[PDB]
Symmetry: C2
Subunit: 334 residues, 2 copies
Amino acid sequence: GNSPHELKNAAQRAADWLVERQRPNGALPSRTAVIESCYKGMWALHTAGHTQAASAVADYVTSLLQPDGDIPQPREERYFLDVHYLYANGYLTIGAHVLGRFGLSRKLMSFVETMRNPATGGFRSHGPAIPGDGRCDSVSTSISGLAALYTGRVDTARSAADFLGSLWVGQPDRKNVFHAVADASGAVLTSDDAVAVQVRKAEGDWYFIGLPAFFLTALYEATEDRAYLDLATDLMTYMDEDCDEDAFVDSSCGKAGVAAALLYRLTGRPRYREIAEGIGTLLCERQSPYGYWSEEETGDVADLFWGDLDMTAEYVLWLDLIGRNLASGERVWA
Amino acid sequence: GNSPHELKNAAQRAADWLVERQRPNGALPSRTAVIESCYKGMWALHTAGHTQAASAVADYVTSLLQPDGDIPQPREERYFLDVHYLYANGYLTIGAHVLGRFGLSRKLMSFVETMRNPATGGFRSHGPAIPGDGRCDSVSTSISGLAALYTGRVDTARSAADFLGSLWVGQPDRKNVFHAVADASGAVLTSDDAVAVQVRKAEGDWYFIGLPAFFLTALYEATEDRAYLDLATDLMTYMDEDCDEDAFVDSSCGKAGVAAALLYRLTGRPRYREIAEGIGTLLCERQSPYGYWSEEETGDVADLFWGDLDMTAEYVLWLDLIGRNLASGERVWA
């Protein structure tokens, strides 16, 4: 497969594509003005070295920030309302913090903490304006824990890991389905309206497992508490051995690829290098000749549907993280 | 002078020069193998988007890390022994944290905190192998406070700001000298063995004032506490109106340039834009056509004396920070 240098070259061409089309107010070129079009942009563009463009996204995000530290609008996609509302807030917090926008990151992260369930450590799936039952899911919890790690709120991250452990141990039928949501008391939810990954089918949503694996590995790196490494290990084993091959092929596989690349750097296990290399190469092969990623668009377009803009920024970030952990992993272990 | 985009383009030329000459273990191309040649490298190369190179520096740094979280060797320059020992550790902590190397950043920052004076908030000037009297200086304290901000240890940052305020209030002759050091009890040291900037002379050492100004402005951004804004602006006004013109011309002026750029974004005051623009343009003017900066060398060299290599990574960072704060300041204040 492709070398770390080649993975990064792909990321850089996509970052250049994004910045060439960035709007004067800092918004990325989405066909709809929604926060789910650009929430990964600060972090992705900073990793690519495009710090003025990343700071311009920070300016745009700051213009939307409400007194309570949330960005409730503009939001349209239901997954950003009642499935994992905080998924936008978590990447915004990380990107703001690494840019040194410490006021923005403190305000964002302080709002994220108001949606934490103090009994279970999970983070509520639905935002303040969105009626709901207090359920908490694996993605809201893992991204909020990762944002807690970058902002130095390690106790909040450890409690997010506790929730993920309970969600894993509590699965009623893990060989057939991964139920990614718990009720407010931490019992796994099996209702039709709660996200489930059909693990023996090729139907996506694998990031409900892969993002927890990435976050837990980062938490192990931060703390050296082997409980977190063991849970990350168990989730990677689950995806590799009990899940359909689509777990490492679907567009959502990048989180598991990043987790594998980090696990390779920390442990040296070659299967993790293989998983990360395969995923990085797949994403590289799917890139358009112009620089963006889309599963449908094929032309020299000036803007993208919000989901493709999000995917494009996401793959700048994942190819960067995969490449740097693979390159350092080779230095350490090979 | 130069536009924000031009400042960034200069930073990128320098980062490419460094990466092309990076050694297999991750060290940067210094004529002596010393930590003072590469301590700014992780942060500088990450801001330039060269994350594999930055991670390679992190691998080298990790290999030198001692059980107590310090890197006591290799060190040769006395400023990194008894004047501001922790100046190296502070940039290492920031660079490790922004790379997501959370175990490295936790261990480095925890060592830094063992050198904090709990009564004064200052950080001791001399490292563990180096005898001394417990004196604490403005540079050790400011860089340790900035590392605390990046790692989320905000109480430590507030305490460092307390030290800086006391140092500033306690100056006995600010018109003529800035005494950058206090004793273990918190009283300003005026002996000739303690760093003293001759503020009415063109003799350098301005970063003992400019780095506090940058750190205090970042702390204001993080907290909105106007006490920190007011101390930062007092220091900028001091450098602009009471110090020799050399304060904005000497090679040490970059910290003040970054502080001015941030203050412009936060306050809109046009003089801060002018100071930042002037400093960024001067740094760009002094860059070798080959991409590095050097006090004496001009050709196509394969490596550099440690101080020139440090300055080169330093100006990658400062040109980037000046550029993004001026670009965003223009957007905000238009």
